[PDB]
Symmetry: D2
């Protein structure tokens, strides 16, 4: 054979390239020299293919992989065709049960390093030295939808990190919002059954916008805080690179003295916080349901490595009861104004997997996977979680040896007396399978807890009380955090929250549920309640108008760290600009445009009304990445229309729609020269408007203005103008 093109244009270059420049590839082929200890120890299971013979799984070479064995060339397939049956059998058994929740997720390899030793507050080995590099495997996910559901749904996002430390696996299994919907793990199945597709008909997919969700919510006010975050633009992140991560639960750090410190874990996106807007998110679930998975993969292939700073909120044990909320209550956040986040280290995601199924689908994360130096608390949500991941993994991954699946293997030593189980890989040579034993001199042996390399010993928390199935009275406060969140949002963020509630409740068929939910909103904030009520054609009653607001949280009436946008933090590197081409583009504009974008690490995608190429005004041939319809504005962060023969595309319905959609979605638009003729489809005044860059040509001043708008992510001042744009 030789089916590959002779020019070798089927194989992507093994060097960092921008999104769309090359065909994507398995991580180890795309970036063979990107290495970490985990990545190198997977080498024993990596399988090549080039220059090898096609075989059965038994090593038998296949001569004809196009046909079944049959009696006569038009005859019946024979039972002795063991080659076909192994091939069909393996194919028949490819699928495994998806994750009960978080079925849909995208993952990558990276590494973590602390900024300084933390041995004063924890004996966790991986945090003990700034020169200690810990390999990590991170899986980002949605919650509700299946493995085949869309990425840009409105939903909570999971942010799971597997740390391969020298003293064991530590999994930090968090989300992108700082609290959870419920307090006690006992209600997890209830909450999840409510949010998931309804049981009679299994609708709807990847949406909380249905009766059972809001029914549960209306009846369980502890859910409101997380509901507020889901309804804000927090629920529709622009990318996994631009969202926060949180452990949610208060855990413990244990030092070598044995002193305990309460801790809440944070992931700060070094690319900053950025979210889509609902219409864009929802239309993007249809134009590219793999948008976040793709963005993650392609950012890493381009060298735009996702980077997060690990941060700790540290509270002394003696301060347990100093807040007006319970620290153990997972529906309560610790305002950063009260307890600052300490920057602890940085994680870089620099390598995609080779095989999605082998590494991503089979990865198993557990919040209970902790290491000496860390400890749990009595948080009733976390307590039940400790039981569940262990349990589900047994059927999801077919047995108790899931830790032998390559991606899950610890990189450090593991020796115990556990044996057998389905698909046992380890061949134990120990003469003993029990302890104590004398026949192997008691090895492997226990190890006393200690400052370093010691056995795990639980912090001896004092436990006093009767065996009761009872919610702590301290957890029974449901509206102050939701109010603190609401009040900390900008006015446009508030409006997006109102719009999120209004949209969702509109799809709740039973009108009494919307009413009960509006009643809950009235206990949070009157304005919020009223605005949602008005969109539902619901009138608040007298009594609902007089519900006294909940108290501030420890004196706080807002905390800007809860807003996505209140405090500027955007980074343009890794963002993407759509350039609407024409058949005689002014080459000087393109040059200026492309040079300025490249200087900021901003990618461009060159669009036209057909594929192939177009020729600029000087014969510069411009290759076309996609059509206007093929790569809608939804997939880019800003839109630039260079000068040239504008009449070529000025009647292109698609070209005009591109601009109106970008405009509706608050994206920066830049128009050069006669590209300003496009102002009429998006109805911009002759004197202009903030958010629209326009000039005689696309020089350096024009790009600075454009790039400044992109750093501010979206043009929020345009909100009130998009009403009268039919798009």
């Amino acid at each position: 054979d030789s089916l590959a093109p002779e020019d070798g244009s089927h194989r992507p270059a093994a060097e960092p390239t921008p999104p769309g420049a090359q065909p994507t590839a398995p991580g180890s082929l795309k970036a063979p020299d990107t290495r970490n200890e985990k990545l190198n120890s997977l080498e024993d299971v990596r399988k090549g293919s080039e220059n090898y013979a096609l075989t059965t799984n038994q090593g038998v070479r296949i001569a004809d992989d196009q046909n079944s064995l049959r009696a006569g060339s038009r005859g019946p397939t024979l039972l002795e065709d063991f080659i076909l049956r192994e091939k069909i059998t393996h194919f028949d058994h490819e699928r495994i049960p998806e994750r009960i929740v978080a079925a849909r997720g995208s993952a990558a390899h990276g590494y973590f390093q602390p900024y300084k030793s933390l041995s004063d507050i924890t004996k966790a080995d991986f945090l003990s030295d700034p020169n200690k590099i810990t390999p990590v495997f991170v899986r980002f996910s949605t919650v509700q939808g299946g493995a085949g559901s869309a990425d840009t749904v409105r939903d909570i996002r999971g942010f799971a990190t597997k740390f391969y430390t020298e003293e064991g696996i530590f999994d930090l299994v968090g989300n992108n919002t700082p609290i959870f919907f419920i307090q006690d793990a006992h209600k997890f199945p209830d909450f999840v059954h409510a949010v998931k597709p309804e049981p009679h008909w299994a609708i709807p997919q990847g949406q909380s916008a249905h009766d059972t969700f809001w029914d549960y919510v209306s009846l369980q006010p502890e859910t409101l805080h997380n509901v507020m975050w889901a309804m804000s633009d927090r629920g529709i992140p622009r990318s996994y690179r631009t969202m926060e991560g949180f452990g949610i639960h208060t855990f413990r750090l244990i030092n070598a003295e044995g002193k305990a410190t309460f801790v809440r874990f944070h992931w700060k996106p070094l690319a900053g916080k950025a979210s889509l807007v609902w219409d864009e998110a929802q239309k993007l679930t249809g134009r590219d349901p793999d948008f976040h998975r793709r963005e993650l993969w392609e950012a890493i292939e381009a060298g735009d490595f996702p980077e997060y700073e690990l941060g700790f909120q540290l509270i002394p044990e003696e301060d347990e009861f100093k807040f007006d909320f319970d620290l153990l209550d997972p529906t309560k956040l610790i305002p950063e104004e009260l307890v600052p986040v300490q920057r602890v280290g940085k994680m870089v995601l620099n390598r995609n997997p080779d095989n999605f199924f082998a590494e991503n689908e089979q990865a198993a994360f557990h919040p209970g996977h902790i290491v000496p130096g860390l400890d749990f608390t009595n948080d009733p949500l976390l307590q039940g979680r400790l039981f569940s991941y262990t349990d589900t993994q047994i059927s999801r991954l077919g047995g108790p040896n899931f830790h032998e699946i390559p991606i899950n293997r610890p990189t450090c030593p593991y020796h115990n007396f556990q044996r057998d189980g389905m698909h046992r890989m380890g061949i134990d040579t120990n003469p003993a399978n029990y302890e104590p034993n004398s026949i192997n001199d008691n090895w492997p042996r226990e190890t006393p807890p200690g400052p370093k390399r010691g056995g795990f010993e639980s912090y001896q928390e004092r436990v006093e009380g009767n065996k009761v199935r009872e919610r702590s009275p301290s957890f029974g406060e449901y509206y102050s955090h939701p109010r603190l969140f609401w009040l900390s949002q900008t006015p446009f963020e508030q409006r997006h929250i109102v719009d999120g509630f209004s949209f969702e409740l509109s799809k709740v068929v039973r009108p009494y549920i919307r009413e009960r939910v509006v009643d809950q909103l009235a206990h949070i904030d009157l304005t919020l309640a009223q605005a949602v009520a008005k969109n539902l054609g619901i009138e608040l009653t007298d009594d609902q108008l007089n519900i006294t607001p909940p108290p501030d949280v420890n004196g706080l009436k807002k905390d800007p760290s809860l807003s996505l946008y209140a405090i500027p933090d955007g980074d343009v590197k890794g963002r993407v600009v759509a350039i609407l081409l024409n058949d005689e583009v002014r080459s000087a504009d393109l040059l200026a445009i492309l040079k300025a974008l490249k200087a900021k690490g901003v990618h461009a995608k060159l669009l036209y009304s057909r594929m192939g190429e177009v020729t600029a005004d000087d014969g510069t041939v411009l290759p076309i990445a996609a059509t206007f319809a093929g790569a809608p504005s939804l997939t880019v962060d800003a839109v630039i229309v260079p000068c040239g023969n504008i009449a070529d595309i000025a009647d292109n319905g698609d070209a005009n729609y591109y601009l109106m959609e970008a405009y509706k979605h608050l994206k920066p638009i830049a128009l050069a020269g006669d590209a300003r003729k496009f102002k009429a489809t998006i109805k911009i005044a002759d004197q202009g408007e903030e958010g629209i860059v326009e000039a005689d040509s696309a020089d350096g001043s024009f790009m600075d203005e454009l790039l400044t708008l992109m750093a501010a992510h979206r043009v929020w001042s345009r909100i009130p103008k998009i009403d009268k744009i039919p798009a």
Copy 2:
């Protein structure tokens, strides 16, 4: 308790209602008077709930289904909480592997009746008498995406019918286009891997618009015929009600005298043929990924029964 509204507006009318008029409901609650032999035989496994006490799977009534058992109300959860562990355990094990292909599908019960006896050409009992009614269970599906993928993708559609006959179950497992992409079953994994999400990143979902699919097609010209059908508006049906169905293969009909006749099976939509247009289809995967499932459920709830000849 007093959770339901006093006006009873939480319960959908148990009668035919048009789309959007009432919340949808389990079929036997929505339409209790509809019956067939197969639906009556499922009665022994059906479980109600109104007026029953909440229990474990061993029948122990639960007193507090809001909390775990702990040492103190702010204390650690205890291992002896068997109610919590049974509930979470069942919850933890809810999923089963989705179908290798056709993971995304919508089904419904119904019945079949032949217009006349076909005993001159087949001794199949279910086609032997116009008065013989055969209960069916039909699952419509896409091919490529997972169970959580969108309905209005561009894809082939499956149309499987389970016939509960008196001489055994007969399954007529077909598609909405008259041919298949490939000739020999040996290449099934090849073709299915080529159309499915590429193995390095598992993109894209529910789409044949990516390199590996077209690579395969370009190298295996036998696939062109079904590709033509896929690229036409047959790849995006308006609903499962407005698409044809085909068994594709030539099977055999065998009569009582032992005579064999070659037969190709067809399903004719009595609501006629109708498809979306690409743009509409794709936007709709975003606006309502469950549109075909919903459309089918609602037509049946409304009394607009999908009919096929």
Copy 3:
């Protein structure tokens, strides 16, 4: 802690040692220098223990492995004890489904080598060169009983060999009898259900002595040939080392020129053929249900490697229809008088596994696992088998990736486009997962068939006929092979067959089934039928007495290769002798005795009325291996009683019964000096009798005589003398 005895006696010497001398141990610790390519390829999953810290599966060191985490030392166990929960979880999930048949099996690693190139008749790479060594993994097994059933039951034995060749795994999955019970695989479940424990109460285990088996047999005369083999002493082998092995089916060898030759596979035991006698075997299932497993393992630890010679019955394609029986009928054997076995190679089993579960329990053999140079035939039993193993392994071993379980992995390359599945270990980097593809230049690629290293292509056999569910009329002959077998047995073998049938039919509760079996036997041979009828109190009718015997098999009225004992092939190496001690053993007899046994590789076990030591007449301290009741005569091949203070054991019931049992089971007995007092125990005349070695001391020819008896295995002439005797 440090629990081993200072002295180091907890650990066995890593050198060959006789059975009972040291504690047995994992193969790689017992014989670290015994290597082969497959043993070395398993090093990647072998796990040590000595000097490592005890950890969870995630690598977290454990401090206290004696206790659960509780609230207070007398308090409730906490859900947060993740160490407890992982430990118990792994334990809870240790088991996997046992094999549907052959659940009870004992396995060992070894190697194979051909005597000369077989290139003229097969292109199979493992048979192409005498210097080409092929690693093997062999499992021996019973059929009916569970994995926990006993070894020395009456049953057929399995003999499965996994050949790890350079061109693929080749599994030869045979039995210890040259035919099977049934003709077509469609009746396998019927036959197996019939022989297995009855469905209402799951009785009996490991036994065909029950109604449903004999009911099936009586209604399906095709089963009679293999029933005869099972009823003979063939069904109770002395050891897996002393039984023949056979592929049963006719397969094809294909040479490079494309010529097909019919072949039946044979394994000749280099230690010769030897079986137990029923009373010993049944009793041995109680005294030591692990007798065969133990003997195999201890033979290997001792260096008495089980050795077998691969042999081929070869038949040209033109001779297919030249026999009275169909070559494709698996209920028919090919008499070695008609088609001799040509010697092909030697297989030596020289290392025990490390972990029984991982290597033995998870091993998956498959007769459809063939390599270029071999092919199948239309044998209808073989045809169905090709389907069954593939299917069963997908649930037994949890998925389609069982070829990745270390023991089953090919040692040669394996590359294809098969992906995912539960427990997927290989991480594929191939950009393509389908062929044909241009994106990986079509790799891995198909390979045309050729003389060496080529793709598999089936032999192009002509197929002609209608699609029918029909038994070939050539298979409809059931009694002539049974008769040929019968006539080839010695008189004492024939009595044992009569006794096996009588015993088994005595356990069939429904008398008419017994009568129906008797009627079938009367179609085989009148003497056989009458002797069994007589033992069951049945009288043959006059019509039965005149049923004409079936024809000879192609002119043969007997074939001595069908007998265990007709042609001497006795080998004493690895056999064992019981030595009955007293408290003043004549040390001179003992030196004479032990050295003579040692010279022939015959082991000994020094037995007494208690454990500890005895002091010989010269002060020599003699370590006791076991008591008379502890290691009964069933476990040894012969008994020697040396001179000394015989009055010490003369009135010991166990010592006397020891000799009665060994005398009853036809074992050689040797009595030195005053040990001749035991002659009255077993009723021996003053003169002496053949089978009893006696002399004033163990000097001169005492040991050579004893060893000549051991070479002939059992004293068959004593049979009539055992009739009486209360033992």
Copy 4:
């Protein structure tokens, strides 16, 4: 869960309770019971919260653990009284 293939082992005939059993647990391998309850969660208003929790009581009440007093530190320690 592995010996009997899933979480629905209470549906295997020999294991089924002979008394009533209703809850909001769904699915799992080999699910026999076909639930008609509109709701698969509680609290719910759509099925009027059925099936419902039952207070503990003298007869036919819901299960309530005996309220033993628990006092001690989180320890992996054998009681000295067991020694």
